[PDB]
Amino acid sequence: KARVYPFEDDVEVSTGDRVAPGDVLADGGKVKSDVYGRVEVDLVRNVVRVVESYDIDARMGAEAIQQLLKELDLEALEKELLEEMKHPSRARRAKARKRLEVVRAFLDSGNRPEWMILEAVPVLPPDLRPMVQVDGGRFATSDLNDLYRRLINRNNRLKKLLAQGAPEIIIRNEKRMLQEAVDALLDNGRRGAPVTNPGSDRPLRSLTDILSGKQGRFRQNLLGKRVDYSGRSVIVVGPQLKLHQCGLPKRMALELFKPFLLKKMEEKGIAPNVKAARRMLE
Amino acid sequence: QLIHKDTGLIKEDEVFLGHIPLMTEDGSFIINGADRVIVSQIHRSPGV
């Protein structure tokens, strides 16, 4: 489906452009083409095939979506949906409000929809996802790095490809994969689940996972901390004790107050300085 | 015993690659120096 436009005398454009009818085409202007499409260059009969393909923009993935978010005035839709609020008594009025509150929150508490999309992926400080040596020549880490890795890999690969003006397919496809890696990191399992490529097909503890440790319904979460001046032992009854008192193994007591104690020591001839008492009790 | 279509009956009568634990005179086991025990567990007998 293309319009054969044979030419002769003057020249045209370059086999790939969108034309409909464009300012000029060929032969010193003796040629234009009210009809749309993209240029194809024949070099024999100085003829030109112009398949019709007006320039439309239909992108995939985020980019696309992202655009939309930007290209959107809330102040608008706001009062817009506001006009479905009661008018269609019960049917379309339901959805309306639903969709509407969102906005209000966005609209109100200053933010920007576009934000929900990504191109700037944060990274935890190292010592929070450390890499440490352990046993006779081996170390350990957090899955993140891994997650993180694969991700980077993908993105950088991607770059080249574009830099390679490659078939938008593999490209798209690539992006596709990338996106995956993306979420894969944020919250693993929310769609298909990746595991240590090798060994235990156990999933990798992702952000969310790690976070709320939701893989337990945040009902059994590992809630609790360890105290410093704590201690434990078995109990016995002290008939001697007076209500507000309680027996305490010196030995145990000792540790719990070491510092204070130390000080006192020093505070008394018996102990010249600190490290003294310190070792002095070791 | 591995044979061949040519009735090639070559029989390497040996393969001790794997060894398995033994049960003590009393009935327990020695795993990596640790006295280990195995608990006989129950289930739903196979039938209709």
Binding site: - | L2, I10, E12, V15, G18, I20, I31, R36, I38
Partner: protein
């Protein structure tokens, strides 16, 4: 039963050998490997519930 798993896990191994196995350069234990079964049982006891 545990003996069987790593056992069956060896046959899997041995069957993957008929593929690139020579006419008769396969006979004995060139088709062999305990590790899989070795682990199974080993893994078993040692790390059994």
């Amino acid at each position: 039963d545990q003996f069987r798993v790593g056992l069956a896990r060896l046959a899997r191994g041995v069957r993957e050998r008929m593929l690139m196995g020579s006419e008769d350069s396969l006979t004995p234990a060139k088709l062999v490997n305990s590790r899989p079964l070795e682990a199974a049982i080993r893994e078993f006891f040692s790390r059994s519930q």
